[PDB]
């Protein structure tokens, strides 16, 4: 996935002590893995929640975000680990982290959704939102640009 690669590219961040030259203990803290659980509820054993509940409750259709830290000390001398929750992360319908992912149209009708319900949109506070696709420059291609504003970047600027 992309979340793991991104959290890997984030890297590590360190900070030293104020007690003994040497600065103290490194504290190489970071995050190694991040996961999104399919949305669930506590009403004992967890039960699957479906977007019909999120729409009728006028609430969000959110799963659970679990980040596992790597609390390292002294350049890897001692490593502690913890799976910290990170609040309710909104999920969009008909995705691999949604409970309507591979449901047949019959099963979609059985769970009140639609005969041919399509996803691509999150539910936030009972309101359905989507994130618009943007047009941006093409990746990894150096394109020549003659732009007048470059001359405004300073004197002696073409």
Partner 1 sequence: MIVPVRCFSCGKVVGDKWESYLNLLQEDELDEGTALSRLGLKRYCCRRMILTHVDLIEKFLRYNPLEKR
Partner DNA sequence: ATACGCTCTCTGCTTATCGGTAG
Partner DNA sequence: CTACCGATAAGCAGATCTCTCGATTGCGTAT
Q: How far is the CB of 53 from partner 1 (least distance, A)?
A: 14
The three state secondary structure string of the chain is: CHHHHHHHHHCEECCCCCCCCCCCCCCEEEEEEEEEECCEECCCCCEECCHHHHHHHCCCCEEEEEEEEEEEECCCCEEEEEEEEEEEEECECCCCCCCCCCCCHHHHHHCCCCCCCCCCCEEECCEEECCCCCCCCCCCCCCCCCCHHHHHHCCCCC
Q: 127 touches which of DNA, partner 1, none (CB within 5 to 8 A by kind)?
A: DNA
Q: Which of 72, 85, 59 is nearest to 51 (CA)?
A: 59
Is 149 a residue that touches DNA (CB under 7 A)? yes
Q: How many residues bind DNA (CB under 7 A)?
A: 8
Q: How far is the CB of 47 from partner 1 (least distance, A)?
A: 16
Q: Which of 147, 156, 157, 158 binds DNA (CB under 7 A)?
A: 147
Is 20 a residue that touches DNA (CB under 7 A)? no
Nearer to DNA, 140 or 152 (CB): 152
Q: Give the x-and-dash track for 117-146 against DNA (CB under 7 A).
A: -------xx-x-------------------
Nearer to DNA, 90 or 119 (CB): 90
What tokens were used for 132? Answer: 């618009």
Is 155 a residue that touches DNA (CB under 7 A)? yes
Is 87 a residue that touches DNA (CB under 7 A)? no
What is the binding site for DNA (CB under 7 A)?
124-125, 127, 147-149, 152, 155
């Amino acid at each position: 996935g992309l979340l793991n690669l991104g959290v890997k590219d984030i890297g590590e961040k360190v900070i030293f002590d104020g007690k003994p030259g040497y600065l103290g203990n490194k504290l190489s803290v970071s995050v190694e893995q991040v996961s999104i659980a399919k949305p669930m509820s506590n009403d004992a054993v967890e039960r699957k929640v479906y977007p019909s509940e999120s729409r009728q409750r006028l609430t969000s259709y959110r799963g659970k975000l679990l980040l596992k830290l790597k609390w390292s000390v002294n350049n890897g001398e001692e490593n502690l680990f913890e799976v910290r929750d990170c609040g309710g992360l909104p999920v969009m319908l008909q995705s691999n982290r949604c409970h309507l992912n591979k449901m047949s149209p019959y099963e979609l009708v059985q769970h009140k959704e639609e005969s041919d319900e399509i996803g691509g949109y999150f539910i936030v506070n009972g309101i359905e939102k989507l994130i618009r696709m943007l047009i941006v420059q093409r990746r990894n291609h150096p394109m020549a640009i003659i732009r007048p504003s470059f001359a405004n970047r300073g004197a002696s600027y073409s």
